[PDB]
Enzyme design. Structure first.
Site, PDB file in Angstrom:
ATOM      1  N   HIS A  44       0.819  -1.209   0.000  1.00 15.24           N
ATOM      2  CA  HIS A  44       0.000   0.000   0.000  1.00 15.24           C
ATOM      3  C   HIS A  44       0.853   1.259   0.000  1.00 15.24           C
ATOM      4  CE1 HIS A  44      -3.365   2.390   2.313  1.00 15.24           C
ATOM      5  NE2 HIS A  44      -3.269   2.764   1.049  1.00 15.24           N
ATOM      6  N   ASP A  93      -0.847  -7.415   1.308  1.00 21.36           N
ATOM      7  CA  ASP A  93      -0.221  -6.109   1.507  1.00 21.36           C
ATOM      8  C   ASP A  93       1.239  -6.348   1.871  1.00 21.36           C
ATOM      9  OD1 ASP A  93       0.180  -3.466   1.697  1.00 21.36           O
ATOM     10  OD2 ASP A  93      -0.914  -3.155   3.586  1.00 21.36           O
ATOM     11  N   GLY A 186       1.535   6.441   9.260  1.00 26.02           N
ATOM     12  CA  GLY A 186       2.970   6.572   9.152  1.00 26.02           C
ATOM     13  C   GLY A 186       3.726   5.376   9.674  1.00 26.02           C
TER      14      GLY A 186
HETATM   15  C1  LIG Z   1       2.973   8.616   5.544  1.00 25.67           C
HETATM   16  N1  LIG Z   1       2.100   9.600   6.165  1.00 25.67           N
HETATM   17  N2  LIG Z   1       2.569  10.827   6.445  1.00 25.67           N
HETATM   18  C2  LIG Z   1       1.503  11.428   6.984  1.00 25.67           C
HETATM   19  C3  LIG Z   1       0.368  10.593   7.043  1.00 25.67           C
HETATM   20  C4  LIG Z   1       0.794   9.403   6.500  1.00 25.67           C
HETATM   21  C5  LIG Z   1      -0.007   8.193   6.325  1.00 25.67           C
HETATM   22  C6  LIG Z   1      -1.408   8.076   6.221  1.00 25.67           C
HETATM   23  N3  LIG Z   1      -1.815   6.815   6.059  1.00 25.67           N
HETATM   24  N4  LIG Z   1      -0.652   6.130   6.072  1.00 25.67           N
HETATM   25  C7  LIG Z   1      -0.625   4.691   5.898  1.00 25.67           C
HETATM   26  C8  LIG Z   1      -1.129   4.314   4.523  1.00 25.67           C
HETATM   27  C9  LIG Z   1      -0.444   5.122   3.479  1.00 25.67           C
HETATM   28  C10 LIG Z   1       1.011   4.859   3.187  1.00 25.67           C
HETATM   29  C11 LIG Z   1      -0.038   4.471   2.177  1.00 25.67           C
HETATM   30  C12 LIG Z   1      -1.322   3.950   6.992  1.00 25.67           C
HETATM   31  C13 LIG Z   1      -2.628   3.487   6.912  1.00 25.67           C
HETATM   32  C14 LIG Z   1      -3.179   2.802   7.995  1.00 25.67           C
HETATM   33  C15 LIG Z   1      -2.421   2.577   9.142  1.00 25.67           C
HETATM   34  C16 LIG Z   1      -2.914   1.833  10.298  1.00 25.67           C
HETATM   35  C17 LIG Z   1      -3.943   2.277  11.137  1.00 25.67           C
HETATM   36  N5  LIG Z   1      -4.610   3.472  10.902  1.00 25.67           N
HETATM   37  C18 LIG Z   1      -5.944   3.642  10.720  1.00 25.67           C
HETATM   38  N6  LIG Z   1      -6.160   4.918  10.486  1.00 25.67           N
HETATM   39  N7  LIG Z   1      -4.926   5.520  10.523  1.00 25.67           N
HETATM   40  N8  LIG Z   1      -3.969   4.639  10.775  1.00 25.67           N
HETATM   41  C19 LIG Z   1      -4.369   1.502  12.221  1.00 25.67           C
HETATM   42  C20 LIG Z   1      -3.774   0.268  12.479  1.00 25.67           C
HETATM   43  C21 LIG Z   1      -2.750  -0.186  11.647  1.00 25.67           C
HETATM   44 CL1  LIG Z   1      -2.022  -1.717  11.977  1.00 25.67          CL
HETATM   45  C22 LIG Z   1      -2.324   0.602  10.573  1.00 25.67           C
HETATM   46  F1  LIG Z   1      -1.339   0.160   9.759  1.00 25.67           F
HETATM   47  C23 LIG Z   1      -1.127   3.070   9.152  1.00 25.67           C
HETATM   48  N9  LIG Z   1      -0.609   3.736   8.113  1.00 25.67           N
HETATM   49  O1  LIG Z   1       0.582   4.150   8.187  1.00 25.67           O
HETATM   50  C24 LIG Z   1       0.460   6.901   6.217  1.00 25.67           C
END
Ligand SMILES: Cn1nccc1-c1cnn([C@H](CC2CC2)c2ccc(-c3c(-n4cnnn4)ccc(Cl)c3F)c[n+]2[O-])c1
Length: 236
Positions: A44, A93, A186
């Site tokens: 992702h 993923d 993140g």
């Molecule tokens: C990088 N960046 N800088 C600024 C913002 C960001 C950013 C934004 N979203 N993401 C990523 C996806 C994106 C990289 C494609 C993401 C998506 C989901 C999760 C997540 C959650 N969450 C649910 N709601 N929020 N988190 C919960 C549990 C578990 Cl286990 C998770 F993995 C973590 N991340 O990192 C990075």
């Protein structure tokens, strides 16, 4: 990481920070060193990444502020996304980054072992999620790498919490019933690392969840043991 605490230098030496440089340089995702030329991360992460040219892999980093214009990084030679990946919540993923050169391992940059053959029925009780992600749903990328100890949840319990999704044997879930500790924005692509017989294994890849650290909503991780054959085929 929600509910976590600051790591110290050298504490999680397989953790890397993957940066994008388009249109600006910033932390994009976590990842894990699994070989001298290989990072395991989440597919992702590469949504909207036009090519590997704009990526930088930084290892041995504790604070994001350590990264300046002369900080060494690894170029990415290839992004290998699982051929069945469509979106994080539907599984697969998982991605490999082949680096342009080999990591020489040091105290600050070390590989983590994959789950071992014959350990299929090990109950992992010492599992940690790490990253520079948000400390709550509306936040910012953190300077210091954070850590949190999180218990694994059965796939049966996880499915009951996510009845709008198909929780498969290729996912593993982790979280407290009352919430409070979890990955967040993140942290994805980084490791869910579990210690067994004093050896760390890469059990999960941080993938998705409903909110961050909500009660009865565990984080969902790619179940790495179910992709070992895929990883070995690609890295050989
Ligand atoms: C990088 N960046 N800088 C600024 C913002 C960001 C950013 C934004 N979203 N993401 C990523 C996806 C994106 C990289 C494609 C993401 C998506 C989901 C999760 C997540 C959650 N969450 C649910 N709601 N929020 N988190 C919960 C549990 C578990 Cl286990 C998770 F993995 C973590 N991340 O990192 C990075």
């Amino acid at each position: 990481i929600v509910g976590g605490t600051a790591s110290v230098r050298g504490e999680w030496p397989w953790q890397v920070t993957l940066h994008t440089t388009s249109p600006t340089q910033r932390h994009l995702c976590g990842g894990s060193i699994i070989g001298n030329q290989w990072i395991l991360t989440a597919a992702h992460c590469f949504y909207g990444v036009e090519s590997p040219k704009i990526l930088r892999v930084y290892s041995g980093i504790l604070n994001q502020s350590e990264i300046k214009e002369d900080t060494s990084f690894f170029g990415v030679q290839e992004i290998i996304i699982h051929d069945q990946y469509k979106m994080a919540e539907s599984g697969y993923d998982i991605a490999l980054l082949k680096l342009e050169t080999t990591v020489n391992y040091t105290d600050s940059q070390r590989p983590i072992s994959l789950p071992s053959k014959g350990d299929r029925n090990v109950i992992y009780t010492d599992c940690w999620v790490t990253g520079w992600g948000y400390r709550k749903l509306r936040d910012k990328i953190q300077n210091t790498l954070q850590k949190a100890k999180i218990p694994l949840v059965t796939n049966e319990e996880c499915q009951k919490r996510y009845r709008g999704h198909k929780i498969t044997h290729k996912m593993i879930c982790a979280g407290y019933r009352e919430g409070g500790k979890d990955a967040c924005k993140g942290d994805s692509g980084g490791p869910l690392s579990c210690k067994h017989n004093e050896v760390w294994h890469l059990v999960g890849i941080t993938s998705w969840g409903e909110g961050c650290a909500q009660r009865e909503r565990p984080g969902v991780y790619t179940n790495v043991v179910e992709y070992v054959d895929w990883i070995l085929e690609k890295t050989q």
